[PDB]
From a paper:
CHD4 is an essential, widely conserved ATP-dependent translocase that is also a broad tumour dependency. In common with other SF2-family chromatin remodelling enzymes, it alters chromatin accessibility by repositioning histone octamers. Besides the helicase and adjacent tandem chromodomains and PHD domains, CHD4 features 1000 residues of N- and C-terminal sequence with unknown structure and function. Auto-inhibition is relieved by a previously unrecognized C-terminal SANT-SLIDE domain split by ~150 residues of disordered sequence, most likely by binding of this domain to substrate DNA.
These residues form part of what is predicted by PONDR25 to be a disordered segment of ~160 residues in length (residues 1540–1700). Furthermore, our X-ray crystal structure of C1bC2a reveals a SANT-SLIDE domain that closely resembles the structure observed in both CHD1 and ISWI. Second, a β-hairpin that links α3 and α4 in human CHD1 has ‘relocated’ to a position N-terminal to the first helix in hCHD4; Fig. 5B shows the high sequence similarity between these two elements. To test this hypothesis, we titrated 46w60 nucleosomal DNA (without histones) with purified CHD4(1380–1810) in an MST experiment.
Numbering used by the authors: 1400 to 1439, 1445 to 1468, 1488 to 1520, 1696 to 1808
Amino acid sequence: LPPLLARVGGNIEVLGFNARQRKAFLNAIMRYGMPPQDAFVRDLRGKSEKEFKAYVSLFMRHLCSRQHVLTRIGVMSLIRKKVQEFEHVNGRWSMPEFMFNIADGGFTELHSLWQNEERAATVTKKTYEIWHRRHDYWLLAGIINHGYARWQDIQNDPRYAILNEPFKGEMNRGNFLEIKNKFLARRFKLLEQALVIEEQLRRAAYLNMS
């Protein structure tokens, strides 16, 4: 109901939103992506649902850092599709107290990585201590529950303790929290690619026919 463009108290408000709300919004979009139609907001605490969608749809038109926001919003949607695809069979706890695949068609090293990694996880039976396909699901699951590139919030969550298990050897190293963060970032960057490639493969399979 507020005006798209207005001047109140010495500042410009876009649909009732001040810069503080306007900046906060973007920060929460880069971190979580777009809420799917509806979903659970700090500076925007007082904002209502009525005003919320007013901004989103108005933000949408704007989109079509312009590309930056576009890709981050899309990527986070790709991750949400994948996690939801297998959420049921895997549960919500990595190490309690399984199924996962990404169809990149062999265009990223992932499938070759997964093969070698899963060989050792099975022959040694050390499932949680050898990073493999299983760990990438829970890495992706964390990126949704906790946000984009939130390695520390993900690590501290018991739900994703599997991500910590392959690195118990270097707990005494001063840089410990870094080595982990550098592995997760280098890993998620690959997953990001495979996720995007799988989408381009699904979309081209339709030959541009809905």
